[PDB]
Amino acid sequence: LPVVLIADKLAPSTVAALGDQVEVRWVDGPDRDKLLAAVPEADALLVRSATTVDAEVLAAAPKLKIVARAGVGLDNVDVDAATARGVLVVNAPTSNIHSAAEHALALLLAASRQIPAADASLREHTWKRSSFSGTEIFGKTVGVVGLGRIGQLVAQRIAAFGAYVVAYDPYVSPARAAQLGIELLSLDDLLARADFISVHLPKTPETAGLIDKEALAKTKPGVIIVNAARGGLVDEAALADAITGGHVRAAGLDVFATEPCTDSPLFELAQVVVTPHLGASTAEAQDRAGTDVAESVRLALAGEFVPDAVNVGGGVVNEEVAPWLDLVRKLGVLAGVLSDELPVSLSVQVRGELAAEEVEVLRLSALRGLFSAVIEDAVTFVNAPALAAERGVTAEICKASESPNHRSVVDVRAVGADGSVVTVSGTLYGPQLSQKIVQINGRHFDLRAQGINLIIHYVDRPGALGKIGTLLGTAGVNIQAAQLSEDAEGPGATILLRLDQDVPDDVRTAIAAAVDAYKLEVVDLS
Amino acid sequence: ALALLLAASRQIPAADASLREHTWKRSSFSGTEIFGKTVGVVGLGRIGQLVAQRIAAFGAYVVAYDPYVSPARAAQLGIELLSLDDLLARADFISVHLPKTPETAG
Amino acid sequence: LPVVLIADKLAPSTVAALGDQVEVRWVDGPDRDKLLAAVPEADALLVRSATTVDAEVLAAAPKLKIVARAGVGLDNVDVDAATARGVLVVNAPTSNIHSAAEHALALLLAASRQIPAADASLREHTWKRSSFSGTEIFGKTVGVVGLGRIGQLVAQRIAAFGAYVVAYDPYVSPARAAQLGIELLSLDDLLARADFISVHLPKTPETAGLIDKEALAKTKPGVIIVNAARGGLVDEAALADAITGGHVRAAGLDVFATEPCTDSPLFELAQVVVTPHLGASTAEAQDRAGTDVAESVRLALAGEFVPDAVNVGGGVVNEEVAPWLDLVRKLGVLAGVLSDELPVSLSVQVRGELAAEEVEVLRLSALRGLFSAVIEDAVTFVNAPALAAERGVTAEICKASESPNHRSVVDVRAVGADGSVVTVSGTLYGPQLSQKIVQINGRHFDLRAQGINLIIHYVDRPGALGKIGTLLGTAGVNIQAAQLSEDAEGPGATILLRLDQDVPDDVRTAIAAAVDAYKLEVVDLS
Amino acid sequence: VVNEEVAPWLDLVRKLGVLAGVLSDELPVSLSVQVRGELAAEEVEVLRLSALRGLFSAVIETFVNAPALAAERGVTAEICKASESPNHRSVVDVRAVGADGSVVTVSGTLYGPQLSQKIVQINGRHFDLRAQGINLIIHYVDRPGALGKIGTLLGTAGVNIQAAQLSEDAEGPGATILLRLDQDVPDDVRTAIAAAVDAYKLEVVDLS
Predict the structure, then answer these.
(1) CA A329 to CA A366: how far, in whole Å?
(2) Separation between Cα atoms, residue C67 and residue C87, nearest integer Å
(3) Residue C110 — φ and ψ, nearest 5°?
(4) Which residues, 6 or more positions from A433, have their beta carbon under 8 angstroms from its beta carbon?
(5) 20 to 30 A from C4, CA-CA: which of A264, C75, C141, C428?
(6) Which residues bind NAD(+) (chain B)?
């Protein structure tokens, strides 16, 4: 009878979802000696955040099948390690959404009404009612930056206050927004137009420090801004500058560029409400984490599908199909990048020898690629059913016996809402099974799918390759591989380069001007 | 009203103060989710009805006590009318307001 | 133990899907005396096409729950009668698709290669090999008119011959086409561009006689055309004219404007292959019809959902929600008509008192509305799950306690792929519960949702109402009700009229010119 | 009877031989043609002749004079057929060894409806270029500016590039490059290019 080791503060009621087919025991997880002694006969490991599920732990745990995190975060878990030992990692990704949206709302009201200061004022014994002045919400515009689950929640709640909602999110399809009854804007237009901004981005180099000194300066004077989402999404220093200057009326942070956080100058400003990362401190949110994580462990031990799965592990993937996960992920990205807007759907097409395999994971990989920009690292799998409902993009697979050129090739067709298609293809071959991008939109070639790749679609005149190469040489950037050809027909040609580092902004720009680029992108294929 | 209901539910002022004092007392707070919970509104003047409508969007059920309110209006507001007794038994939150008849209130 | 009366030639194996929870008996259906005697204790009635399930039959059958048709057609069934007696009608809508696509293909090849004539030639004992000349398919363009299931099937098959496929179908979303790897064209562009045309439209006044003398004249000389779909989709006389003139090379009809068909002049032309409605004459297609219809009867007797359902019956619908089916159907249409293109999704919104009801059927009604143009009559319900997969449009419901003005109102938001929204609202009120359209795109009013309604969106100058009214008066057409107002802002205003008959084409045109219409539509709301 | 499945390969393999030659600095002492993949099932001896054929067109000012022409210059041909191809469904490898011992390999394939002859390997670097038009190959020192200078000089000569692909080498401090030009390179430009990137080797050959 399977053993489930619970190594963090999780109530047995909280995990009654593990039927009576399992023997459930507890251990004091943050006690290394005890934990290590306990894990050896665990089929399953539930943890919260106090326990660190380490390289050492997993090696101590040779019978392990599922390490489950009752929570959203993964920082206390070394997934890559679990992946390499065949151990399925899972979490509770949607267990905190309600508590966190509610907190965003709390912070928003608390800040517009100077609550803790008022409350503090009666705590000192003074009637300073005349000094306060709050901001009314009815009829105001609210800008939601990032329209994932929590942002869509906050959007429903705030809307019922009679606010207008607008959002910025290049990773929600326009139709999906419109269904939510939300107007999609460039982050420029939101900034200008919102009276309230609540931010709801994951943390990704794409994202960190979005709302900088330069962004705050486009915001409506009188803005109230709220970040209950991540780390340093809104620049603490530039915020302090704007509060003080009065340009922004108030703020509410739940999260800090670096926590534990004790010494910010934000704690000296009054008009800024702050709380020590409370968004998910709710008995309801912790129980949900547990009950969810229980259910996943159940599915996982019945050998059923595990949609909350973070990675791959156990025979859930053939050795022959395994190496294609990463590459298809890469096509996904690329197809994302080469698209004008966000595709309404991915059509993963698998041809040649590979078509004999179970290749349904590869559809998950493509999506995981396409959405790299709003997905945090450790996550490798994601919920397709959930993704569709939330953002409104889907994916499907099609197998085909014949592969025209290579023995096996995977083609990713990003389809645009308007009927247009971008296609990107890769294969693997050779004793090393290296990843090669072998087609982009009718253009065949062979490039290692690795490193920093620059892609340009410019005007085909003599010496454009010159201009591009020579500009790069001046930036002191080496080219590892390059490829160009035709455009279907017309003006325009298409180049792709592996470089040894990023192209800095002014340089990136100079190139667009020198070949008169239509489009110019830079993508990290690692 | 909604502001105070959330401040009280997430302990905002106590929390904020912890930081003011330069302590990381994250581990000291534990709040209450509104979602799926039942909210008692006592008294249904325009404000109480507005509050009923703002809370329903948090996904809470709203019951309320107010014997002079148009029952129609209450069902349009998504509200289940109750006796003050039953509301008191079933409420996870309660927000009290001027009733429809000013000072039928006790 | 439930009784299932099988009144047509259907094998017991063919219906083994009805578990052993039922007592199954047969009757000679086309024998009225026998049938009528048999039906009284039937809980269920399976028929094929020989039996006519009549007003008389249903009244003879007071215990009846499901009349099931092993087939696609319904002409042998009076649904409206079954609807009014609470008896659920069902069919096998997708049982013939493979046999019918294959037949289309058969006809296409048979005709391009003059097969029956060749075969006929060896039957007379002559080696007339030198006289024949067939048409090769590889590299040719094939135009598929109507991209429903069968058309998408034919499209996959023909594509594997190395043909290019293009299609005309304003009721498949552009993204859906592109996923199928098909280029969507105006029927004008298809006509010009196709070397082969196979047609795949249902029969609807929208549709009957599409390919007329005028259409055939835009087709590529050398076209081969194939109609295996419906009745008279391609005009028999105009086809005969073009075959003879040589402009079209060959044809293949499986179906006839009026069948039984014995005397067409098409039977005198050689280059036209003809067969007596064989598309579904396949033992595989009949067994499928049966096995499908069995399964529906099973679900229906377990009181489970019945997706193949053609109508409503049994407590599957509250009396209070019942009268809203038709009206919401009407919004669906309207929302279709007022949209620039085909919506990617319908957002049915139900507000006020009605929000207390089970209103999931209303989502089905909206879709049934939107697709009226490609749906045959008797069908009232349709498969939403199937609709989405096929055409790529979805629908959802949202309930809301409050209705701003009326006590109950339903709003249908057609959302465009590009994020734009058309909204059309109706209610019912009064002792008669008459259907009223009460909002279109921010404009509130009160119009009976019945009759022939003309809608114009023209330029707002003085006397435009004059021009419109006076033009109509000259066409001798009476106006029963009218409504106009503002456009959001800008130039343009919007009028809606109930008329006692159609606006003929030249007149319809004259109006557009006189108010300088942007858009002008005419819709039958019955 | 040359088999319908093999016929399209003749011209391509001829091309492979023009490449193997123009690329060896010394005239070669052996030429080795290796068919791998589905083609191996066919009788491909006539491919050897094609290879030898290009190879001698590209060095000496028919299909039966060739084998005897070769022996008169010490060049020995060999051909190989193996079912295993590790990437393409079919691929032919032409291989020329020099007196000293230095190796050159070039590979082609056909695929698609228009079975287009593509070049695919040059010394263990992978490419997918149409084996047609005037191509310029360069083996040079891999450093920043290299690509810049090649382009700038070509541009400056009014020479337009149709397609091109370059890759850094397996282990050397060098890199390779293949460009399709719309016209030939005057000799001086060839030399100016060579000097500029420290070309170990430069060549222009015309794959009509």
Answers:
(1) 5
(2) 7
(3) -50, -30
(4) A323
(5) C75
(6) 46-47, 66
Q: Which tokens go with C329? A: 């159907």
Catalytic residue among A41, A136, A206, A259: A259
D195: number of Cβ within 10 Å:
12
What is the rounded radius of gyration, in angstroms, for the C-alpha atoms of chain C? 26
What is the 3-state composition of chain A as percent helix, strand, coil, each rounded to the nearest 5?
35, 25, 40
Residue D20 three-state SS? helix
Place of tokens 């009226």: C372
Helices (H) and strands (E) in chain A, counts: 16, 22
Assigned token pair, D69: 């022409």
Instruction: Give CATH for domain C96-277.
Output: 3.40.50.720
Going by C-alpha positions, the residue among C472, C452, C474 that lies closest to residue C464 is C472
Show the tokens assigned to A273.
């409400």
As given in the structure block, the two tokens for residue D20 are: 């193997």
Beta strand pairing call for A479-485 and A493-499: antiparallel
Which of C169, C184, C344, C402 to mutate: most A Cβ within 10 Å? Answer: C344
B53 contacts in chain C (CB < 8 Å): 402
What is the spatial distance between Cα C304 and Cα C301, in angstroms, rounded to a whole number? 7
* C-beta of residue D151 within 8 angstroms of C-beta of residue A463: yes
In a 13 Å sphere around the CA of A454, the CA atoms on its Cβ side amount to 27
Answer yes or no: are the C-beta atoms of C276 and C252 closer than 8 Å: no
* Residue position matching structure tokens 């149409």: D130
Q: Please say whether the dihedral angle defined by the alpha carbons of residues A342, A343, A346 and A352, taken in this order, is positive or negative.
A: negative
Q: What is the resolution of this structure in A?
A: 2.7
Contact between chains at D168 and A462 (C-beta distance less than 8 A): no
For chain C, give every domain's residue range. 1-95+278-317, 96-277, 318-450, 451-526
Q: Compare all CA atoms of chain C with the CA of B49 and give the residue at the minimum distance.
A: C402
Task: Establish whether domains A1-95+278-317 and A96-277 are of one fold.
Answer: yes
Task: Report, in angstroms and rounded to the nearest whole number, the Rg of chain A calculated over CA atoms.
Answer: 26
Q: Domain C1-95+278-317's class?
A: alpha beta
Tally of CA atoms within 13 A in the half-sphere of D104 that contains its CB: 24
Chain C, window 194-253: residues with a beta carbon less than 8 angstroms from a chain A beta carbon: none
Touching chains, A (3+ CB pairs < 8 A): B, C, D
Experimental approach was: X-ray
Task: Considering the domain delimited by C318-450, tell me its CATH architecture.
Answer: 2-Layer Sandwich (3.30)
Closest residue by Cα to residue A346 from A310, A382, A315: A382
Residue A353 designated active-site: no
Query: What is the gyration radius of the CA atoms in chain B, in angstroms?
Result: 16
Alpha-carbon gap, residue C34 to C57, rounded angstroms: 11
- Nearest CA to A499 out of A516, A512, A482, A515 is that of A482
Q: Which residues of C are catalytic?
A: 230, 259, 277
